[PDB]
């Protein structure tokens, strides 16, 4: 059987196809610039269901995937009972130049669920449970000297994304409400140990913290900022920072969170963003006018005034502190009174 690649180096495969006389493809899960993700049955392990990430036959992707595999091995080694909520690898192999990584099959990611729910946001009890698990998952990675650097809703999966369809009487429309809010953290390809080389830029732009934009260096607090942006997005169903460029991003940060601390401004070599100790930007530009119209103080985005909403917003604001040294740690976050509302099942991790 000839193995075939398309023009971009993606493996040509379809439902029905097999790999290593072992993994039978039974579905398509998704795709990206890295290649594709298929659902397989693993005939060597009782037909167990797997998500198999199939990387393009392109050197720079094969190399990144090899690094991801190495990261995953180290993580598994530190969490042998798979207790700390990560999507860990069951197998990996090089298939005619395509690196393939097999993972236990979970449900949809939290972005895809949001999207299939027409971007209607998660209810607060759901946001609260998800935030709790995220703080705990990352706290454990952080305590093992690791930073994720690429947290975003697409990288957070429901263990099971089965939902109930409920009629929202205030909206005159149906809503999908996930039956179980247990989640797992995925995509460790960019994860960086304390002692390893730190690239100047990390994170997906919408989830990238100011110390990274200002090239001030970064560590574990990077992940805390990203979690704050994620929690906003779960709660409102739209992205906190919908931006494509650094200068606009910083202006959004200022409108939503207040001024950038002067000490950060004085320390950055990125002085092109500043003029006279202050952000410089064209208020009359397409980006200028978009930000002035759409970006408001964080507190203004609260849907309700009850105590649990106030506590969410207090927590989010502490996650979104400009100075990574002042930013709440996840150890501290887990002590926040926002988490008093967890059911005992949610708190003990069921
Ligand atoms: N372990 C695992 N299970 C799943 N399941 C899944 C994926 C997509 C969908 S879909 N097609 O969006 O409804 C449903 C279930 N995905 N998955 C993984 S590791 N996805 C994944 C990811 F979440 C981030 C980067 C690469 C990936 F391959
Ligand atoms: Cl490319
Ligand atoms: Cl191995
Ligand atoms: Cl200005």
Numbering used by the authors: 134 to 483
Direct quotes from the study:
There is a growing recognition of the importance of protein kinases in the control of alternative splicing. The serine residues in these sequence patches are phosphorylated by several protein kinase families, most notably the serine/arginine-rich protein kinases (SRPKs) and the CDC2-like kinase family (CLKs) (Colwill et al., 1996; Gui et al., 1994). The phosphorylation status of SR proteins regulates in turn their cellular localization and activity. CLKs regulate alternative splicing by phosphorylating SR proteins, thereby modulating their cellular localization and splicing activity (Prasad et al., 1999; Tardos et al., 2008; Bourgeois et al., 2004; Eisenreich et al., 2008).
Interestingly, superimposition with the triazole diamine cocrystal structure revealed one Cl atom in the same position as the primary amine nitrogen that forms a hydrogen bond with the hinge backbone. In contrast, superimposition of the two CLK3 complexes, with KH-CB19 and CDK1/2 inhibitor, revealed the preference for CLK3 to adopt a more open conformation with the P loop moving away from the ATP binding site. Therefore, the markedly decreased affinity of KH-CB19 for CLK3 may reflect the energetic penalty associated with its induced fit.
